[PDB]
């Protein structure tokens, strides 16, 4: 739907990767920091990324787009 996706995606039957990643709700974390590997098996994921959750907005993993939020505060 966006201009970035329209450059390569000429098929409107399915949802774009941008919309698909926006649909998965943020993952709630007990703590201010979370490590994302992108896979249950770290060797099959992306390089480990440590994400700070100090902001109120959901924090995005810069590799896979998963979002994390603080569970309590």
């Amino acid at each position: 739907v966006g201009n970035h996706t329209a450059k390569w995606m000429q098929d409107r039957s399915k949802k774009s990767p941008m919309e698909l990643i926006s649909e998965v709700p943020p993952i709630k974390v007990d703590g201010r920091i979370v490590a994302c590997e992108g896979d249950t098996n770290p060797a099959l994921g992306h390089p480990i990324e440590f994400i700070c959750l100090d902001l109120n907005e959901p924090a995005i993993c810069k590799y896979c787009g998963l979002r994390y939020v603080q569970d309590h505060h």
Binding site: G2, N3, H4, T5, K7, W8, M9, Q10, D11, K15, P17, M18, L20, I21, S22, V24, G38, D39, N41, A43, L44, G45, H46, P47, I60, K62, Y63, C64, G65, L66
Partner: protein
């Protein structure tokens, strides 16, 4: 084939390592920041007629985004159809994901 995460997000982050290492210069990439801030490609092309099927791109990729799949039966009647674009490669990954993931699990103990 280009792969995705189980959420549907593309694995490729436009690092251009595969493009730099490709001995045949068969890969052409363009990229920019997506509307949500993500680092993603807007163009990913592989000239299947320049490619030498070496697997160097698969070795260079840090997120297991580009892979050489098990398919070998894709002869075409035109030169044009062998100029693979991003959408075609992502289609290949969708079609062959279950076999690719199985091979990656088996081969993970060696690389």
């Amino acid at each position: 084939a280009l792969r995705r995460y189980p959420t549907g997000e593309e694995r490729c982050i436009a690092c251009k390592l595969c493009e730099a290492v490709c001995p045949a210069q068969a890969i052409t990439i363009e990229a920019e920041e997506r509307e949500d801030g993500s680092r993603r490609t807007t163009r990913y092309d592989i000239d299947m007629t320049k490619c030498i099927y070496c697997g160097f791109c698969q070795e260079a990729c840090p997120v297991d985004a580009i892979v050489e799949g098990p398919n070998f039966e894709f002869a075409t009647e035109t030169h044009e159809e062998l100029l693979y674009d991003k959408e075609k490669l992502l289609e290949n990954g969708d079609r062959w994901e279950t076999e690719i993931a199985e091979n990656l699990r088996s081969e993970s103990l060696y690389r």
